[PDB]
Design a protein around this ligand. Structure first.
Ligand code: MG
Length: 240
């Protein structure tokens, strides 16, 4: 089993390529100010993480800004605050400000020389374009929650991706699903019969951050602590 066995990398975006945690912590500051309390980053992220996937189940066909607006409402409710419409809009439209991790662009531009690069993301098509402009590559295929009609970890999101790649001549054995989220990505990738690369962005941190808690530890085939480390690994694997 090695990195060079695969023709395509399929990616989570938010949490693996885009640093959604910095974005979410930043975007929650006005609402948090209204509570009178100073939250830690992990507290802000974890209340997001207890709420985002439930919301995606609640409104599976919602565009991502509508998910985020409704997550704002859920967090306000946990905090005893009435939603403020303008504050909710500022939070819900914040993806435009969520930055790439500092290694992401360089790693993607390298890996784009060697793999078809594919997005399988909890996002809608137009919102993703804003993040794609921060990622520095053309993706060969982009599969969004909007395309599927549901959000990961729904198995249909994985089936849709696998089928789309098969039509482009990429067999399932050719795919390496590359992501941080045990819950959203690696558990359903196991169930879908995919090979997995775990990018453990939070390797030096507590808990799961913005990501929902996983029900079990899935089986992963590679672990790298960053995208740059996956790229460095490939540079050596390619010499084999
Ligand atoms: Mg509700």
């Amino acid at each position: 089993m090695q990195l060079t066995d695969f023709k395509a990398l399929t990616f989570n975006c938010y949490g693996t390529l885009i640093d959604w945690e910095t974005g979410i912590v930043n975007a929650l500051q006005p609402l948090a100010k209204r509570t009178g309390k100073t939250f830690t980053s992990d507290e802000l992220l974890e209340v997001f993480g207890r709420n985002e996937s439930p919301q995606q189940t609640e409104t599976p066909g919602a565009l991502y800004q509508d998910i985020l607006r409704a997550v704002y409402d859920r967090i306000a409710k946990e905090w005893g605050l009435e939603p403020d419409a303008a504050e909710r809009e500022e939070f819900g439209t914040s993806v435009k400000n969520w930055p790439a991790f500092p290694d992401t662009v360089e790693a993607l531009q390298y890996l784009k020389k060697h793999y078809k690069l594919v997005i399988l993301s909890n996002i809608d098509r137009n919102e993703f374009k804003l993040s794609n402009a921060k990622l520095g590559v053309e993706f060969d295929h982009i599969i969004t929650a909007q395309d599927v009609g549901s959000y990961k970890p729904n198995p249909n999101n994985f089936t849709y991706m696998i089928d789309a790649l098969a039509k482009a001549g990429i067999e399932k054995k050719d795919i390496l699903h590359t992501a941080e989220s045990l819950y959203h990505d690696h558990i359903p990738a196991n169930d879908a019969g995919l090979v997995s690369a775990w990018i453990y962005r939070r390797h030096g941190k507590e808990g799961y951050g913005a990501t929902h808690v996983p029900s079990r530890m899935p089986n992963v085939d590679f672990r790298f602590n960053s995208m740059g480390e996956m790229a460095e690994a490939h540079k050596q694997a390619l010499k084999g």
